[PDB]
Design a protein around this ligand. Structure first.
Ligand code: NA
Ligand code: NA
Ligand code: NA
Lengths: 519, 519, 519
């Protein structure tokens, strides 16, 4: 381990071995000094115009962190295509992480003149929250992950966290965490860091779409032996009185047939069209938003439980806050136009999951008698019911991979709503920080903590290797399947490539459900 | 294996060994040529009067299939009685299936004169969908199962299936399956077929009724140490003002007592009386029906989640679509009269499950203050809640046995709603078909597929043996239990026997819950 | 491997061992940052004046590459002379490549004042395209190879490639390649790199000229026993009528003699004289150029198939685009004068290959009869014919060595037309790049890829050792052979040496065919 010796090589590749695929990606990173080496209490109350739904109390820290919770951090577009076009499923098995070729640079600023040089003896500090003692900030769809394109140099995100709050104030249970309290490895140029991790057992992601629907599992050609109430009143003319008539469900009465299952849970969202002219002329994104109520404040149930984005022929419709939406390259942070973002679609699950913008179904609302007509009620919120079956939200090339399951007494189907794998012991948080280097101190002793430091930052490479287990497709479907494919005809540029300006871009969201499977 | 040698014997019997009972039944079957040896696209759209709730797209195939998913296919009435009167539970363990004494006959039709003869060299084809690659059509309560009566010769059902559809059209994900794509055993008279299967671990069916109710589990003689808000206002006369009074639940206030559990989930159905005069005079079977909404179309939640058919003393009431209904011998397929069908009753579960035609309970609907009286809301749809306990629908001698659990990311309490055992790997589908035998072809070559075949059908016997594990009763109940019993006094015929015409009939539905068990 | 230790020595030499000769050359190189560390889509359509024949779509990359596909990269002039004056042939067997004594320097630019210093902790990245997954850019006669003169420091070429295009647009099949996707070795000053490679079996290059011609292989002294049609009409005066006369080819009728072979294939090029006055006064270089037509665009067949540059006594003539042409030291890039370039000559193959500017031969063009005189057609394009024999283009001291045979279903005599050895698995491409080193990043996190980098470049030495197998000459020719020789009389400077200015130059092209061989 010396100044003149590399401490690691560039490992970027993918190998397919059978029921496994191993991805490996390396990137060059840059880490500045955050918070001026300080920890700062940050808060936001209800003063000014800040609403109560957005209050918070927490801290910003001088630390940065590595994040690769995004599929494109590991799969190239072509690899993603190889995965989704041929496998009914897949899942993470184990990973290796490495930090190397570290270099700490210090910048001198005198008379407009700026010079940067190495500080051969400075160190960075690194450690993993292997015992999950820090607030788990990963799994919240934050920016700062390794770039999709291998040639892009990225900046390391700053670590910050939240605790309990009451307005802009802290409460008795509010917790303060000092990351310097943890043992951490100190590396100088020449030193490297690495660790291994094994994923817990988790189900394969459903990278397939159903080629059958819950309400169409019977034999088209045979009647049931079971009967259903088919008539409640006579029909012979005008002397119509009450009676009781029963019939057997059959090919023409599939909606009446007795069935064994029920569609998945529902939490109805407001519908909105991509054809603005068809929408009400008001600003309802928030006022008509589907939300949950937690201790006084409201949050969008975004994207909320997995529901079909729209029913047959209505591609223009989508749940106001019930789908993942990515931005196109350079889309504005605020009020970006529809043509600057990319809406995803969980259309593939219409097959088992209720459509996100409609009722779950209908229930009786009273007791009918001869003097009281029967009444019905529309169900727009339907929790788990015995016999329900459903699918989870799909995952995307540019979407999240996993999330830490909250440590609670209970929960229900812990599949992270934004999509992905829910893990009790997810990949550990990897914290990194440039060690503060005092600028000359006074010549006579003083109690005060130093606050004058040499200006510096660090850079180096990072590698992440993940082994994935594949669940091969075993279909007897005779006719060809749907497959993700590149466009055929000429185009100004190549999809999933760089610009004349060297800018890489992801033209569209790529899901995972192309192959089909029976129910 | 020769023309003159039987390839199997008649095995029909039952043996009880302790915590096991083995059923064995053989039947004679007949298989015609279906679809003229062809596969046909079948569809039903929204034209004519066909409603959208009944649209579909699928295929009919030239294949038949064996089905024995009906308890009476294995248990004789007496055996069913032996089972339900002495065991708290039971479940399937393993099975053996066999096809033998196969004979293919061809029929010649010339001048009104019809003759049938053997075609000693023809074959039938058989195979099991052991990898569940075909749409699983069993578990939809279709007719065509082996007959309850051993002497009845039955016809084999034709196999057909459904895929996705949009009206009467197919969509991109629609799948087409060719059963000739699968390896299959070909048998001539003299050949036989057989296979073995083992049921996955599954809970014992609850063949018992609770002799206690969820709201009556306390000691009748002792007060709780816990208190409840008992008074909100003074009582001394007319100067009545707000106050706070607390009391301890006790023998006379069992409805107020603190309890540990909640009744099972609810999805309220409209009530209907068997005394037509008490019903509203309108045709509400469908309009007031309890349904679920899936991709644009509605289906009856039939019979839906398990709920008590009626409360105390109301045997005349039942959920419009919340109970299994069987027909009596020869009941019409359409608009059969009440006296021609047999309604089942889940009355035994009033003990833990909400009554199907009433509310789950009551919740607060606002925040009361001195100027605002408290308001309440009736709950008619209640999904899973921590602390709930419930029972499943009972199974019946003439009811279904199992159903394949849909292949989905999630589900909740996968007990098939029509009743029975939910299995991830249920008994495989057994497909059978008579091999097409060309009638003379032209004398000079022609591209076209032959469409002229010898007319023939097949017949033979089929055996199914299933081993069931019994959960013996261990009750300390002092007084006698309720038991299913034959009627004592004279009758025109014998229940569960044949007619003067040789017709077998099942006079009533026979449940499984006679013995009792504490909560 | 340290900052103060050399990681390799200077190996420049040649050793002759018998049927082998091992060349070894080392050079000092310099590598700048290319494309500002970016990948850029580059294109050229049909707008402005750009013709369709020159359209293209591809990418420029931040990578450089090593190239030594030029004989003078390995053989000194004297060594080349030792080779060509004594061997009938030779070929590459194996090679060793090495990168060492690497130094990365960073340049600071403040107030017109420029300073360069070491960046002891920076790295370069290197890797070989050992599986031929990148577009093979070598073998296209590009500049950037190691210099002929060992003392010259050279600049490393930038890597770029082309894919399919339609005008200036890309198409569906267009491919984008990221070199950071490949595993690569990272070296700091002190680290080194190296690899070994073995050439596939390939024929010896024909470093000889034939001392016999295809049409002169018979015995000068003996008649053939075979006859040929020698007369078609009588000769006795004016009563001349048709007849049939046959004769035996002999010493005076060698042009009529029956022969076993045919001259090599032909693709006639337009002739041009070095005496401008003898040329047509028009600009026909392109309009009269010999070309091939591929998907809408035309390319010069340059130099095209191997054909003799000129026939006897016409050294002044040459195919407009059918010979290799090198420039003299400092010849302009555009419109260089005839006296500034050096034309090569494949004159040695007149012996078997058609002359490049004349017909292949003559064929019948009709069916002659007594009323129809026979007609003939001149053949200017003649593809492979049974019995043909030919020679390939010679190779030159300053010419290319090998080319990768295109991966296609078929091909014919895959000897690269520009000259050299055609290999299915040629020496791998060696890619190199300076790793980007971020200049200080912002102090608060930002999504954007860094675009501010420290200015730097690298330098070091490179070694290439190749082992060549020689095919010794075994001639019984009595009289001396032609040999390449230095001029005898006084001259201003020494051929193949430096200037008074220190500039090395190659005064002339040196072929390989001096010794002779019978057919
Ligand atoms: Na694409
Ligand atoms: Na009876
Ligand atoms: Na010379």
């Amino acid at each position: 381990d010396g100044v003149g010796s590399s401490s690691g090589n560039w490992h970027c590749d993918s190998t397919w071995l059978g029921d496994r695929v191993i991805t490996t990606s390396t990137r060059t990173w840059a880490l500045p000094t955050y918070n001026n080496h300080l920890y700062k209490q940050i808060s936001n109350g209800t003063s000014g115009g800040a609403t109560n739904d957005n209050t918070y109390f927490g801290y910003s820290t001088p630390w940065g962190y590595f994040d690769f919770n995004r599929f494109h951090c590991h799969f190239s577009p072509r690899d993603w295509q190889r995965l989704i076009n041929n496998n009914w499923g897949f899942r993470p098995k184990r990973l290796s992480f490495k930090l190397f070729n570290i270099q700490v640079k210090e910048v001198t600023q005198n008379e407009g003149t700026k010079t940067i040089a190495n500080n051969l003896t400075s160190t960075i500090q690194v450690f993993t929250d292997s015992e999950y003692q820090l607030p788990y900030v990963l799994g919240s769809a934050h920016q700062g992950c390794l770039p999709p394109f291998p040639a892009d140099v990225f900046m390391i995100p700053q670590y910050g966290y939240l605790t309990l709050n009451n307005g802009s104030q802290a409460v008795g249970r509010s917790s303060f965490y000092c990351l310097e309290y943890f043992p951490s490895q100190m590396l100088r140029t020449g030193n490297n860091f690495q660790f291994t991790y094994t994923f817990e057992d988790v189900p394969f992601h459903s990278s397939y779409a159903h080629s059958q629907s819950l309400d169409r599992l019977m034999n088209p050609l045979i009647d049931q032996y079971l009967y259903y109430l088919s008539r409640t009143q006579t029909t012979g003319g005008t002397a119509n009185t009450q009676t009781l008539g029963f019939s057997q469900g059959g090919p023409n009465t599939m909606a009446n047939q007795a069935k064994n299952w029920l569609p998945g849970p529902c939490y109805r969202q407001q519908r909105v069209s991509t054809t603005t002219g068809q929408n009400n002329n008001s600003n309802f994104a928030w006022t008509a938003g589907t939300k949950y109520h937690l201790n006084g404040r409201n949050s969008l149930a975004n994207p909320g439980i997995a529901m079909a984005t729209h029913k047959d022929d209505e591609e223009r419709f989508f749940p106001s806050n019930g789908i993942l939406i990515f931005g196109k390259q350079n889309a504005a942070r605020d009020n970006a136009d529809y043509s600057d973002v990319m809406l995803t679609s969980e259309e593939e699950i219409k097959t088992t999951n209720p459509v996100a913008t409609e009722e779950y179904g209908i229930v009786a609302d009273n007791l009918q008698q001869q003097n009281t007509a029967p009444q019905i009620g529309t169900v727009n919120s339907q929790g788990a019911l015995p016999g329900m079956v459903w699918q989870n939200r799909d995952v995307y090339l540019q979407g999240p991979i996993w999330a830490k399951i909250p440590h609670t007494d209970g929960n229900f189907h812990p599949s992270p709503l934004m999509g992905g794998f829910g893990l009790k012991h997810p990949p550990p948080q990897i914290l990194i920080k440039n060690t503060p280097v005092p600028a000359d101190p006074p010549t006579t002793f003083n109690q005060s903590k130093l606050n004058s430091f040499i200006t510096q930052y660090s850079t180096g490479q990072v590698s992440v290797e993940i082994e994935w287990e594949l669940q091969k497709e075993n279909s007897k479907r005779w006719n060809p399947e749907i497959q993700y494919t590149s466009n055929y005809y000429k185009s100004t540029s190549v999809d999933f490539a760089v610009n004349t300006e060297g800018v890489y871009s992801e033209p569209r969201p790529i899901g995972t459900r192309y192959l089909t499977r029976n129910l």
